[PDB]
Amino acid sequence: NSDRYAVYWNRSNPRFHAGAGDDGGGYTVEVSINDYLDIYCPHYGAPLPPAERMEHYVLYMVNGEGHASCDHRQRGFKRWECNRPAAPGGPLKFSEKFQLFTPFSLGFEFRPGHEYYYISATPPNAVDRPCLRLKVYVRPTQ
Amino acid sequence: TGEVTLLDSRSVQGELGWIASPLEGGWEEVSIMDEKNTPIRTYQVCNVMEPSQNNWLRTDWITREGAQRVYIEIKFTLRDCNSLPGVMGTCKETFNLYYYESDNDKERFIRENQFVKIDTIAADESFTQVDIGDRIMKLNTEIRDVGPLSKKGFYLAFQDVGACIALVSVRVFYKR
Ligand SMILES: *[C@@H]1O[C@H](CO)[C@@H](O[C@@H]2O[C@H](CO)[C@@H](O)[C@H](O)[C@H]2NC(C)=O)[C@H](O)[C@H]1NC(C)=O
């Protein structure tokens, strides 16, 4: 009964609303409890572009303030590293289940009707301005 | 150390080659940040509402090299069923560890009933909602051993029967 929502985390994806100087909130996706987000890191096939031009990120889960400001510091948790844009196997894939209850003590829990936020920074920089960002809305029970 | 690694889940590059049965809705790969804020791959299940869970997870083939006696170190978090609302008839606080000896490097399907049970593994410290709130890991470490082994290698498996459990790491070694 679950379903998965794919999120291609890169600047060319118009759902982030980048390239304009105003993403107006960034990426917005609506999910249900026990649904998944599959996040695909930027990926490049042969012939590879110059190494410096490959998008690479650290993804953070943050509060609203972190989301508004694109600054994760003291505002959230490091979640995932998009550090292999030329991975031979394909795009690095990271999944987030919107579970009620976590089996991992440092994992995360979700509730109907609530909002959750993720942002990226480009190492070695702590903050991207403008950053790519994601708001997830978990539907109310119904 | 005097301990020689035969398999370590944390060192594995990229994705773990492990087979989950069922393939979806049971054990599921989850990437987290470890001790040192670096990434590791974990398997996790929490079907504490629905009855008759029989969720299997099997490693790849592990060579024993020349060792007869091998040790299986499992690090995991396990949720206290009293920290979970509405699941008293169903929630469990143990899982079962199995092994299977094999000369065959690459069996695609291993039948669940070929596996020999090692032990039921319980947690010394089950974690609660205070721990989730306070970001306190309550990491459990459990070690079991198998041997004397007599084939080229073996498979290990983990059977969940309705617990809320995260397998953070698995290390298989022999003693010097
Ligand atoms: C940036 O994101 C876009 C999607 O917005 C990626 O394009 C998709 O790539 C997948 C897997 O390779 C394909 O199945 C889809 O057909 C593509 N979708 C669309 C709408 O074009 C693109 O690969 C990403 N770019 C980088 C460099 O990672």
Author numbering:
A (entry chain B): 33 to 174
B (entry chain A): 28 to 203
In the authors' words:
We have solved the crystal structure of the EphA4 ligand binding domain alone and in complex with (1) ephrinB2 and (2) ephrinA2. Structural analyses, drawing on previously reported Eph receptor structures, show that EphA4 in isolation and in complex with ephrinA2 resembles other class A Eph receptors but on binding ephrinB2 assumes structural hallmarks of the class B Eph receptors. This interactive plasticity reveals EphA4 as a structural chameleon, able to adopt both A and B class Eph receptor conformations, and thus provides a molecular basis for EphA-type cross-class reactivity.
The EphA4-ephrinB2 and EphA4-ephrinA2 complex structures were solved and refined to 2.4 and 2.3 Å resolution, respectively. As a result, only electron density corresponding to two reducing-terminal N-acetylglucosamine residues of an N-linked sugar at Asn42ephrinA2 was observed in the EphA4-ephrinA2 structure. The structural differences between the two available apo LBD structures of EphA4 and the divergence in conformational changes that occur upon ephrinB2 and ephrinA2 binding are consistent with the EphA4 receptor maintaining a high degree of structural plasticity in its DEEphA4 and JKEphA4 ephrin binding loops. These changes include the introduction of unpredicted α-helical secondary structure in the JKEphA4 loop of the EphA4-ephrinA2 complex. Based on the high degree of sequence conservation in the JK loop across all A class Eph receptors, it is likely that this α helix motif is common to all EphA-ephrinA complexes. Superposition of EphA4 and EphA2 from their ephrinA2- and ephrinA1-bound structures, respectively, reveals that the JKEph α helix is well conserved both in structure and in amino acid sequence.
